[PDB]
Amino acid sequence: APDREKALELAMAQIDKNFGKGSVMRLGEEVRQPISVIPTGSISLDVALGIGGLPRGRVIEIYGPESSGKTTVALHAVANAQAAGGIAAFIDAEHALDPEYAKKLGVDTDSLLVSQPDTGEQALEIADMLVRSGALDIIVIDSVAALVPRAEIEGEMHVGLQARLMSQALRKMTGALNNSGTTAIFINALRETTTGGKALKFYASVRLDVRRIETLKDGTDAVGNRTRVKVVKNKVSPPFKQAEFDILYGQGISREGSLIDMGVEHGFIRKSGSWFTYEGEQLGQGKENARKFLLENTDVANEIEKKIKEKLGI
Ligand SMILES: Nc1ncnc2c1ncn2[C@@H]1O[C@H](COP(=O)(O)OP(=O)(O)OP(O)(O)=S)[C@@H](O)[C@H]1O
Ligand SMILES: [Cl-]
């Protein structure tokens, strides 16, 4: 009577039904759940996510050391939800946002709702209220850590409160997020759990481990920094995939850079040691020269984007 593959699928099906699609998956499964997404700003990360971007109506955690590139991704996500006509909100407990930098990443600052709460409770309630209006495509909360409880803020001499705070708010908010379809990005700067990163680990549909890995030099001097993101949790597509990309000083994710990495790995652009070539024409010697080439030769790149796009999904 026993036929494993048969029994297994019956079990997996039963599992998803009882707990939700994505409760169990084969790591190599080719996901076919289009959903609705907010492109990450990084083509590769969109691919790593398996669905083309951050899922809508879900809790997203983006953690890692400072200057890891978390905020950049958050800002790009906002920029993209806006181009699609979405409205964005920013719950700020850090007072670090640099609107001029955000504009550069394409964010329409003037339309950005910003709120600087007095307490963690207040910050999450304001977020809950904004979300339940169903009017937002995305909402980013700067600093899970910054969400300190009112009592602490007022000198209360008694603990476990800030994590409990993140739990209860997350319990209430997820419902509205799904109904509204608003993607909520919690930025968690570390020094995976910043007091309340505890409940966030379970409530999230996606958790991004962001980390700096290399300083982009090309020549002796610095041009920017390369970031590596690992999708440690993904309840909508097989997890653990990884992605890398360049964020040049004063710029967001380098599109050209992403086109040069995927293009090389997917054979569209050949790379003999030190020289990048594309179907019968030189791009230059050195990751950076190629970037320069693609920045200028806008016609190229678009086709390379085209090809890389078609090859996976546009
Ligand atoms: N205001 C800015 N002005 C110029 N460059 C910036 C600015 N913000 C970010 N960048 C660029 O992107 C990098 C920092 O990215 P962030 O997303 O701010 O890092 P992070 O991981 O979010 O660190 P935290 O704790 O949020 S600051 C910088 O090293 C620059 O390359
Ligand atoms: Cl994107």
Short mmCIF file of C-alpha atoms and ligand atoms in Angstrom, two decimals:
data_model
loop_
_atom_site.label_atom_id
_atom_site.label_comp_id
_atom_site.label_asym_id
_atom_site.label_seq_id
_atom_site.Cartn_x
_atom_site.Cartn_y
_atom_site.Cartn_z
CA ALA A 1 0.00 0.00 0.00
CA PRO A 2 2.88 2.45 0.80
CA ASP A 3 4.02 4.81 -1.99
CA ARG A 4 6.05 7.58 -0.39
CA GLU A 5 5.73 10.33 -2.96
CA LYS A 6 1.99 9.69 -2.85
CA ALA A 7 1.68 9.78 0.96
CA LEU A 8 4.05 12.73 1.16
CA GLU A 9 2.01 15.02 -1.12
CA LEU A 10 -1.14 14.16 0.79
CA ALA A 11 0.68 15.19 3.94
CA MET A 12 2.14 18.37 2.49
CA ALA A 13 -1.23 19.33 1.09
CA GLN A 14 -2.84 18.69 4.44
CA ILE A 15 -0.11 20.76 6.10
CA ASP A 16 -0.55 23.84 3.90
CA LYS A 17 -4.31 23.69 4.26
CA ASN A 18 -4.16 23.57 8.06
CA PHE A 19 -1.51 26.27 8.39
CA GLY A 20 -1.25 28.20 5.14
CA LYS A 21 0.42 27.87 1.77
CA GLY A 22 4.18 27.77 2.22
CA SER A 23 4.09 25.94 5.56
CA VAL A 24 6.26 23.26 3.96
CA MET A 25 8.16 23.30 0.66
CA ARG A 26 10.90 21.52 -1.22
CA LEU A 27 13.96 23.77 -1.40
CA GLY A 28 14.16 23.23 -5.14
CA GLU A 29 10.49 23.82 -5.83
CA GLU A 30 9.81 26.26 -8.67
CA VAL A 31 7.29 28.61 -7.07
CA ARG A 32 4.18 29.55 -9.06
CA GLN A 33 2.39 31.91 -6.63
CA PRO A 34 2.54 35.35 -8.40
CA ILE A 35 1.04 37.15 -5.37
CA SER A 36 1.69 40.90 -5.68
CA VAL A 37 5.05 42.34 -4.87
CA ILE A 38 7.13 45.45 -4.34
CA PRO A 39 10.39 45.05 -6.28
CA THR A 40 13.27 45.22 -3.86
CA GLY A 41 15.47 47.57 -5.89
CA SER A 42 17.80 44.63 -6.49
CA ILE A 43 16.99 42.33 -9.38
CA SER A 44 18.96 39.51 -7.79
CA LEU A 45 17.27 39.95 -4.41
CA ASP A 46 13.92 39.89 -6.23
CA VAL A 47 15.05 36.59 -7.74
CA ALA A 48 16.39 35.29 -4.39
CA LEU A 49 12.94 36.01 -2.99
CA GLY A 50 11.53 33.80 -5.73
CA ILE A 51 8.50 36.06 -6.32
CA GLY A 52 10.05 39.17 -7.83
CA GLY A 53 10.00 41.29 -4.69
CA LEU A 54 8.70 41.73 -1.16
CA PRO A 55 5.26 40.13 -0.77
CA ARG A 56 2.36 42.48 -0.21
CA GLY A 57 0.26 42.43 2.95
CA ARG A 58 3.02 40.67 4.90
CA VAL A 59 5.44 41.42 7.71
CA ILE A 60 9.01 41.85 6.54
CA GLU A 61 12.06 42.03 8.79
CA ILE A 62 15.31 43.45 7.40
CA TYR A 63 18.08 43.08 9.94
CA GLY A 64 21.82 43.46 10.22
CA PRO A 65 24.60 45.79 11.43
CA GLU A 66 24.40 49.47 10.67
CA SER A 67 25.64 50.62 7.27
CA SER A 68 24.72 47.18 5.97
CA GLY A 69 22.30 48.64 3.44
CA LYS A 70 19.00 47.87 5.19
CA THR A 71 17.54 51.37 4.87
CA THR A 72 18.59 51.61 1.23
CA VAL A 73 16.51 48.53 0.44
CA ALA A 74 13.65 49.89 2.55
CA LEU A 75 13.78 53.17 0.67
CA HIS A 76 13.91 51.48 -2.74
CA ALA A 77 10.91 49.37 -1.77
CA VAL A 78 9.02 52.55 -0.91
CA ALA A 79 10.09 54.24 -4.15
CA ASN A 80 8.75 51.30 -6.15
CA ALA A 81 5.45 51.04 -4.32
CA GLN A 82 4.98 54.75 -5.12
CA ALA A 83 5.73 54.56 -8.82
CA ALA A 84 2.93 52.01 -8.89
CA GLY A 85 0.68 54.65 -7.39
CA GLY A 86 0.92 53.37 -3.84
CA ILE A 87 1.00 55.53 -0.73
CA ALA A 88 3.87 55.03 1.74
CA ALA A 89 4.20 55.66 5.49
CA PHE A 90 7.35 55.80 7.66
CA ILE A 91 7.25 55.26 11.42
CA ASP A 92 10.45 56.99 12.59
CA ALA A 93 11.90 56.35 16.04
CA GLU A 94 15.49 56.98 15.00
CA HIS A 95 15.42 60.41 13.39
CA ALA A 96 17.96 59.33 10.76
CA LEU A 97 16.01 59.38 7.51
CA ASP A 98 17.71 61.59 4.95
CA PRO A 99 14.97 62.74 2.55
CA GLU A 100 17.49 64.03 0.02
CA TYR A 101 18.99 60.56 -0.24
CA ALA A 102 15.51 59.06 -0.41
CA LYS A 103 14.58 61.34 -3.30
CA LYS A 104 17.69 60.14 -5.13
CA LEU A 105 16.42 56.54 -4.80
CA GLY A 106 13.24 57.76 -6.44
CA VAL A 107 11.14 58.20 -3.32
CA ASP A 108 8.51 60.91 -3.58
CA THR A 109 9.21 62.46 -0.19
CA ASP A 110 6.48 65.07 -0.30
CA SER A 111 3.88 62.29 -0.46
CA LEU A 112 5.61 60.31 2.24
CA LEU A 113 3.73 60.11 5.51
CA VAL A 114 6.21 60.37 8.37
CA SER A 115 5.51 59.97 12.04
CA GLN A 116 7.94 60.38 14.96
CA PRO A 117 6.32 58.62 17.97
CA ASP A 118 6.88 59.38 21.63
CA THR A 119 6.93 55.72 22.62
CA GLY A 120 7.02 52.21 21.22
CA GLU A 121 3.35 51.76 22.05
CA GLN A 122 2.49 54.98 20.27
CA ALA A 123 4.68 54.12 17.27
CA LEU A 124 2.98 50.77 16.76
CA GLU A 125 -0.54 52.15 17.31
CA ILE A 126 0.04 54.87 14.77
CA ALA A 127 1.21 52.17 12.39
CA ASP A 128 -1.76 49.96 13.18
CA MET A 129 -4.15 52.85 12.59
CA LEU A 130 -2.52 53.90 9.28
CA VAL A 131 -2.57 50.29 8.13
CA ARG A 132 -6.24 49.63 8.98
CA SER A 133 -7.30 52.54 6.77
CA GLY A 134 -6.38 50.19 3.94
CA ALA A 135 -4.94 53.18 2.12
CA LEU A 136 -1.24 52.16 2.20
CA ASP A 137 0.89 49.97 -0.05
CA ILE A 138 3.86 49.92 2.30
CA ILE A 139 4.95 51.10 5.76
CA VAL A 140 8.49 50.95 7.13
CA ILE A 141 9.28 51.14 10.85
CA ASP A 142 12.77 52.42 11.56
CA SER A 143 14.40 50.60 14.43
CA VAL A 144 12.74 47.72 16.20
CA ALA A 145 15.14 48.64 19.01
CA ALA A 146 14.00 52.27 19.11
CA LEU A 147 10.53 50.95 20.05
CA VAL A 148 11.18 51.39 23.77
CA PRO A 149 8.12 51.04 26.08
CA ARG A 150 6.57 54.15 27.66
CA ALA A 151 7.38 52.98 31.19
CA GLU A 152 11.10 52.72 30.45
CA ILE A 153 11.00 56.14 28.77
CA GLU A 154 9.60 57.56 32.02
CA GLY A 155 12.08 55.90 34.39
CA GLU A 156 10.37 52.81 35.76
CA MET A 157 12.87 51.61 38.42
CA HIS A 158 10.13 45.21 35.90
CA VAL A 159 10.82 43.93 32.37
CA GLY A 160 10.11 41.60 29.48
CA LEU A 161 7.92 44.49 28.35
CA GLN A 162 9.47 45.64 25.08
CA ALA A 163 9.37 42.16 23.55
CA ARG A 164 5.80 41.67 24.82
CA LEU A 165 5.09 45.02 23.18
CA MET A 166 6.30 43.82 19.80
CA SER A 167 4.31 40.57 20.20
CA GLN A 168 0.93 42.07 21.03
CA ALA A 169 1.20 44.72 18.30
CA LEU A 170 2.28 42.16 15.75
CA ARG A 171 -0.64 39.95 16.75
CA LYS A 172 -3.07 42.78 16.06
CA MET A 173 -1.35 44.20 13.00
CA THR A 174 -0.90 41.10 10.80
CA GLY A 175 -4.64 40.76 10.32
CA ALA A 176 -5.00 44.29 8.99
CA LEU A 177 -1.88 43.88 6.88
CA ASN A 178 -3.38 40.94 5.00
CA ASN A 179 -6.75 42.67 4.57
CA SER A 180 -5.13 45.90 3.41
CA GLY A 181 -2.30 44.29 1.47
CA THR A 182 0.16 46.73 2.98
CA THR A 183 3.68 45.44 3.24
CA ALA A 184 5.25 46.30 6.58
CA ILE A 185 9.05 46.42 6.76
CA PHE A 186 10.56 46.37 10.25
CA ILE A 187 14.17 47.51 10.18
CA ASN A 188 16.21 45.71 12.82
CA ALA A 189 19.68 47.18 13.33
CA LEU A 190 21.87 44.94 15.53
CA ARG A 191 24.79 45.49 17.92
CA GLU A 192 18.41 38.79 14.51
CA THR A 193 16.80 39.98 17.74
CA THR A 194 16.81 43.51 19.20
CA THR A 195 14.59 42.92 22.27
CA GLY A 196 11.43 42.51 20.19
CA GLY A 197 13.15 40.76 17.30
CA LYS A 198 11.80 37.76 19.24
CA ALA A 199 8.15 37.80 18.06
CA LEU A 200 9.16 39.35 14.74
CA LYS A 201 11.07 36.16 13.87
CA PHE A 202 7.81 34.19 14.00
CA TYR A 203 5.42 36.82 12.62
CA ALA A 204 7.42 37.58 9.48
CA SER A 205 6.82 36.01 6.11
CA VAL A 206 10.25 37.15 5.03
CA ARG A 207 13.38 37.94 7.00
CA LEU A 208 16.37 39.49 5.29
CA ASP A 209 19.84 39.11 6.78
CA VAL A 210 21.66 42.12 5.33
CA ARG A 211 25.38 42.45 5.64
CA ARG A 212 28.29 44.38 4.18
CA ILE A 213 30.98 42.22 2.61
CA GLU A 214 33.34 44.22 0.45
CA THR A 215 34.46 47.75 -0.21
CA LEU A 216 34.18 48.46 -3.94
CA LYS A 217 37.54 49.77 -5.14
CA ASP A 218 38.20 48.87 -8.81
CA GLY A 219 41.30 51.05 -8.68
CA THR A 220 43.14 51.85 -5.45
CA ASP A 221 40.29 54.20 -4.36
CA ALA A 222 36.82 53.47 -2.95
CA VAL A 223 33.72 53.80 -5.12
CA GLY A 224 31.17 52.11 -2.84
CA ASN A 225 30.31 48.97 -0.87
CA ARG A 226 28.96 45.58 -1.85
CA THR A 227 26.14 44.10 0.17
CA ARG A 228 25.05 40.50 0.64
CA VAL A 229 21.51 39.60 1.62
CA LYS A 230 20.40 36.15 2.68
CA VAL A 231 16.69 35.35 2.73
CA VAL A 232 16.78 33.34 5.94
CA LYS A 233 13.01 33.12 6.12
CA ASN A 234 10.59 32.92 3.26
CA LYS A 235 7.05 31.66 3.71
CA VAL A 236 6.06 32.33 0.08
CA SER A 237 8.91 30.70 -1.80
CA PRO A 238 11.81 28.35 -0.88
CA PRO A 239 14.06 30.11 1.72
CA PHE A 240 17.79 30.42 2.21
CA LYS A 241 18.53 31.84 -1.24
CA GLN A 242 21.07 34.70 -1.37
CA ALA A 243 21.74 37.83 -3.37
CA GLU A 244 24.42 40.45 -3.72
CA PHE A 245 24.55 43.93 -5.15
CA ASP A 246 26.48 47.19 -5.11
CA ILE A 247 25.45 50.41 -3.40
CA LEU A 248 27.76 53.22 -4.51
CA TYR A 249 28.36 56.08 -2.07
CA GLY A 250 25.42 58.49 -2.39
CA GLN A 251 23.52 56.12 -4.69
CA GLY A 252 21.08 53.29 -4.10
CA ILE A 253 21.39 49.83 -5.62
CA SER A 254 23.47 49.95 -8.82
CA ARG A 255 21.27 48.63 -11.60
CA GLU A 256 24.21 48.41 -13.99
CA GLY A 257 26.11 46.51 -11.32
CA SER A 258 23.25 44.03 -10.96
CA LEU A 259 23.15 43.67 -14.75
CA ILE A 260 26.87 42.92 -14.77
CA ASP A 261 26.65 40.24 -12.08
CA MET A 262 23.65 38.29 -13.26
CA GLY A 263 24.68 38.78 -16.86
CA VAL A 264 28.03 37.18 -16.11
CA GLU A 265 26.61 34.31 -14.05
CA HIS A 266 23.92 33.63 -16.64
CA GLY A 267 26.35 33.69 -19.52
CA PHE A 268 24.78 36.63 -21.38
CA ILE A 269 28.00 38.59 -20.79
CA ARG A 270 31.30 36.77 -21.12
CA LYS A 271 34.19 37.63 -18.84
CA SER A 272 37.72 36.59 -19.71
CA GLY A 273 39.93 37.48 -16.75
CA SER A 274 39.64 41.28 -16.31
CA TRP A 275 37.66 42.07 -19.49
CA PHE A 276 33.85 42.01 -19.73
CA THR A 277 32.38 41.44 -23.21
CA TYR A 278 28.79 41.37 -24.48
CA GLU A 279 27.89 39.54 -27.68
CA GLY A 280 30.51 41.17 -29.88
CA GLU A 281 31.59 44.31 -28.08
CA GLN A 282 33.83 45.25 -25.19
CA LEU A 283 32.49 46.64 -21.92
CA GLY A 284 35.84 47.33 -20.29
CA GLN A 285 38.47 45.95 -17.95
CA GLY A 286 37.32 46.00 -14.34
CA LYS A 287 33.88 45.69 -12.74
CA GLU A 288 33.72 49.50 -12.57
CA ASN A 289 34.61 50.31 -16.19
CA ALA A 290 31.81 48.02 -17.29
CA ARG A 291 29.43 49.82 -14.94
CA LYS A 292 30.54 53.10 -16.55
CA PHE A 293 30.02 51.57 -19.99
CA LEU A 294 26.47 50.46 -19.14
CA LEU A 295 25.66 53.77 -17.49
CA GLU A 296 26.56 55.54 -20.75
CA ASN A 297 25.49 52.95 -23.35
CA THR A 298 21.92 52.86 -22.11
CA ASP A 299 20.83 50.94 -25.20
CA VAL A 300 23.03 48.03 -24.17
CA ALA A 301 22.07 46.90 -20.67
CA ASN A 302 18.43 47.42 -21.57
CA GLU A 303 18.78 44.46 -23.91
CA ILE A 304 20.91 42.67 -21.31
CA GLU A 305 18.20 43.43 -18.79
CA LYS A 306 15.76 42.20 -21.40
CA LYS A 307 17.62 38.91 -21.86
CA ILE A 308 18.28 38.33 -18.17
CA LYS A 309 14.64 39.28 -17.57
CA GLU A 310 13.17 36.97 -20.22
CA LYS A 311 15.47 34.16 -19.03
CA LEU A 312 13.79 34.22 -15.59
CA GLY A 313 10.82 36.52 -15.64
CA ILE A 314 10.27 40.17 -16.48
N1 LIG B 1 22.22 59.76 3.72
C1 LIG B 1 23.11 59.16 2.93
N2 LIG B 1 23.99 59.88 2.22
C2 LIG B 1 24.87 59.29 1.43
N3 LIG B 1 24.92 57.98 1.30
C3 LIG B 1 24.07 57.20 1.97
C4 LIG B 1 23.13 57.77 2.82
N4 LIG B 1 22.42 56.79 3.36
C5 LIG B 1 22.88 55.64 2.87
N5 LIG B 1 23.88 55.88 2.02
C6 LIG B 1 24.60 54.87 1.20
O1 LIG B 1 24.15 53.56 1.60
C7 LIG B 1 24.99 53.12 2.68
C8 LIG B 1 24.18 52.97 3.97
O2 LIG B 1 22.98 52.24 3.73
P1 LIG B 1 21.89 52.11 4.91
O3 LIG B 1 20.69 51.43 4.37
O4 LIG B 1 21.72 53.46 5.51
O5 LIG B 1 22.65 51.15 5.96
P2 LIG B 1 21.82 50.38 7.11
O6 LIG B 1 22.12 48.93 7.05
O7 LIG B 1 20.41 50.81 6.98
O8 LIG B 1 22.42 50.99 8.47
P3 LIG B 1 21.38 51.58 9.55
O9 LIG B 1 21.70 51.38 10.98
O10 LIG B 1 20.02 51.80 9.01
S1 LIG B 1 22.05 53.38 9.34
C9 LIG B 1 26.06 54.19 2.89
O11 LIG B 1 27.32 53.60 3.18
C10 LIG B 1 26.09 54.85 1.51
O12 LIG B 1 26.78 54.05 0.55
CL CL B 2 13.63 45.94 -8.43
#
